[PDB]
Amino acid sequence: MESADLRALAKHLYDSYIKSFPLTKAKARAILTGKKSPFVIYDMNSLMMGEDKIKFKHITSKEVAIRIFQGCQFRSVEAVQEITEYAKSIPGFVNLDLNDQVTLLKYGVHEIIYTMLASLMNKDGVLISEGQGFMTREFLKSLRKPFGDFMEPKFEFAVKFNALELDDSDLAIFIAVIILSGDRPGLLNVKPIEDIQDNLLQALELQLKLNHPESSQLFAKLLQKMTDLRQIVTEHVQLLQVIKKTETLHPLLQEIYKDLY
Amino acid sequence: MESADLRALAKHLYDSYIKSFPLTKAKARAILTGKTTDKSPFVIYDMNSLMMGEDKIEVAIRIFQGCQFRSVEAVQEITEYAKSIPGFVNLDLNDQVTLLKYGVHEIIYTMLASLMNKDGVLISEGQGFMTREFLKSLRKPFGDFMEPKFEFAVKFNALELDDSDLAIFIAVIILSGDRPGLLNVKPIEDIQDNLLQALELQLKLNHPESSQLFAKLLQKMTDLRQIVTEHVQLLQVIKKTETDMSLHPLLQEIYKDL
Ligand SMILES: [O]C(=O)C1=[C][C]=C(C2=NN(C(=O)C3=C(Cl)[C]=[C][C]=C3C(F)(F)F)C3=C2[C]=C(Cl)[C]=[C]3)C(O[C]C2=[C][C]=C3O=[C]OC3=[C]2)=[C]1
Ligand SMILES: [O]C(=O)C1=[C][C]=C(C2=NN(C(=O)C3=C(Cl)[C]=[C][C]=C3C(F)(F)F)C3=C2[C]=C(Cl)[C]=[C]3)C(O[C]C2=[C][C]=C3O=[C]OC3=[C]2)=[C]1
């Protein structure tokens, strides 16, 4: 006497996920498998050609590794706003205390950006600019100093996450579960947050059983990935703090990126 | 993939848990909630009571070594329990070691919660109770080393698991295919899938009113991973101050490359 409601919730989230995000996993997989050919960035010279060709919006430090890093930051700021908009479509979310809405987004966005970045990645590289560009793993990993080692962990996660072979309809519910985490620091009213999460968890369970009937305990396996997510976001923050203390932007830019650096 | 067999696995693990671990949650809760004359613990809440306690059943170090001794015994008990998990002893021996190496700390924390309430922890097989305020007020780094165990336990215990639930939960933790340096992930995940199926049915039957308890329990495996990380880091920092500190080889070996 709830199954229909769970399927309704799944479809509602799917529909909103398609509206909120620029490039779906389905579209990104078509591009990556070669099934409208993207510009490939595999080295310095092709980077320089790519910024002319694929019309990047973050280019104004002239050093390459920094300009790539900054472009990741620029795209992360856009994703935060797309996730924020997506969250508003989650049933019950806008009815929560306003401070709790801000807390949930603040502590959730990093985990969601990682998850969704996996949709744009394979073992060889990552889609950029809505699938119009493709930057190689080897190029990113081979950037100097801390920057190479900052990039590679994202791929290491993606490769593992992608082995679950989730589609967009699965991810739309998963992302919602992450946002509605009752254990975030400083939440004023945990009860309604866990009540919503319980519904989303039910919807994700049924979704995964219907969409992947042959993949046993996929639900559990997906929940275990929340462990990898928490871990890598912690590492992330630590790597950023090291970048800050070593690398020597306009105060307004600093202010725009304060959340992500 | 057949309930009868999932229930059979749950009974097997429960029975083995009872054999391997001295002090169950059921017994600990009976001691903590009291109402009984026969099982009443001596309570240690300060230095004098500690002194009387040692007659009846540096201070921060002696307490630390008390915790350490019990952790070593726990590793031994967990190791014995692991062998009873169907399929575990059949795995590559290196993987066996790796699963125990990365699994034992998460299990110690989980099972320590059974011995705790918000005000303290059972010790000496339930014959003692040492207060949280005493432990937290130990000097230097030691106070802050003790307190996070209680902070976890309070949250974990809110789930109200019983021993029959924990037996399966602990098995799930051990059979984690994502541990670093595992040679053969597949047969580990095959066992885990069975344990997960057994856990899900156990929780549905034993807690039918508790919605998505399965999912909430798996989300606690996230807390565990993080708390073990912090534990290891703080223990490493305590080593670089304390020479009067020494770790049993079993623990020392687990911490190398943890
Ligand atoms: O959904 C998308 O389209 C999306 C989402 C995330 C990234 C991306 N973010 N990021 C972070 O570190 C990061 C991450 Cl996970 C999480 C939070 C904050 C940050 C941060 F710190 F930035 F604020 C990365 C990222 C990608 C890589 Cl490969 C490595 C690190 C992204 O990146 C596209 C991209 C690649 C090379 C370029 O080179 C120039 O512009 C580029 C844009 C896309
Ligand atoms: O199953 C049990 O019976 C059990 C299991 C774990 C502990 C315990 N360990 N520990 C550690 O740090 C610790 C932990 Cl989690 C894991 C690995 C290594 C260590 C270590 F670092 F030791 F090597 C603690 C522990 C307890 C607290 Cl409250 C705080 C830290 C335990 O402790 C009972 C105890 C309390 C006060 C006393 O005071 C004298 O003896 C005592 C025994 C029991």
UniProtKB/Swiss-Prot annotation, chain B:
Q: In which tissues is it expressed?
A: Highest expression in adipose tissue. Lower in skeletal muscle, spleen, heart and liver. Also detectable in placenta, lung and ovary.
> Mutating R70H: effect?
In colon cancer; sporadic; somatic mutation; partial loss of ligand-binding
Q: Where is the protein found, in the record's own terms? A: Nucleus; Cytoplasm
Regions crossing the membrane: none
Task: Locate the residues binding rosiglitazone.
Answer: Q68, F69, R70, S71, H105, H231, Y255
Q: Where is this motif: 9aaTAD?
A: 249-257
Question: Could you state one GO biological process linked to this protein?
Answer: positive regulation of cholesterol efflux
* PTM info: Phosphorylated in basal conditions and dephosphorylated when treated with the ligand. May be dephosphorylated by PPP5C. Ubiquitinated by E3 ubiquitin-protein ligase complex containing FBXO9; leading to proteasomal degradation. Ubiquitinated at Lys-19 by TRIM55 leading to proteasomal degradation. Ubiquitinated by E3 ubiquitin-protein ligase STUB1/CHIP; leading to proteasomal degradation.
Signal peptide positions (record): none
Question: What cellular component terms from Gene Ontology apply here?
Answer: chromatin; cytosol; intracellular membrane-bounded organelle; nucleoplasm; nucleus; receptor complex; RNA polymerase II transcription regulator complex
> What are the recorded GO MF terms, alphabetically?
alpha-actinin binding; arachidonate binding; chromatin binding; DNA binding; DNA binding domain binding; DNA-binding transcription activator activity, RNA polymerase II-specific; DNA-binding transcription factor activity; DNA-binding transcription factor activity, RNA polymerase II-specific
Its keywords, alphabetically, are:
Activator, Biological rhythms, Cytoplasm, Diabetes mellitus, Disease variant, DNA-binding, Glycoprotein, Isopeptide bond, Metal-binding, Nucleus, Obesity, Phosphoprotein, Receptor, Transcription, Transcription regulation, Ubl conjugation, Zinc, Zinc-finger
Regulation (activators, inhibitors): PDPK1 activates its transcriptional activity independently of its kinase activity.
Q: Renumbered to this chain, where is the cross-link Glycyl lysine isopeptide (Lys-Gly) (interchain with G-Cter in ubiquitin)? A: K19
- Family note: Belongs to the nuclear hormone receptor family. NR1 subfamily.
- Disease tied to this entry: Defects in PPARG can lead to type 2 insulin-resistant diabetes and hyptertension. PPARG mutations may be associated with colon cancer. Obesity: A condition characterized by an increase of body weight beyond the limitation of skeletal and physical requirements, as the result of excessive accumulation of body fat.
What role is this protein assigned?
Answer: Nuclear receptor that binds peroxisome proliferators such as hypolipidemic drugs and fatty acids. Once activated by a ligand, the nuclear receptor binds to DNA specific PPAR response elements (PPRE) and modulates the transcription of its target genes, such as acyl-CoA oxidase. It therefore controls the peroxisomal beta-oxidation pathway of fatty acids. Key regulator of adipocyte differentiation and glucose homeostasis. ARF6 acts as a key regulator of the tissue-specific adipocyte P2 (aP2) enhancer. (Microbial infection) Upon treatment with M.tuberculosis or its lipoprotein LpqH, phosphorylation of MAPK p38 and IL-6 production are modulated, probably via this protein.
Q: What is this protein called?
A: Peroxisome proliferator-activated receptor gamma
Say which species the protein is native to: Homo sapiens (Human)
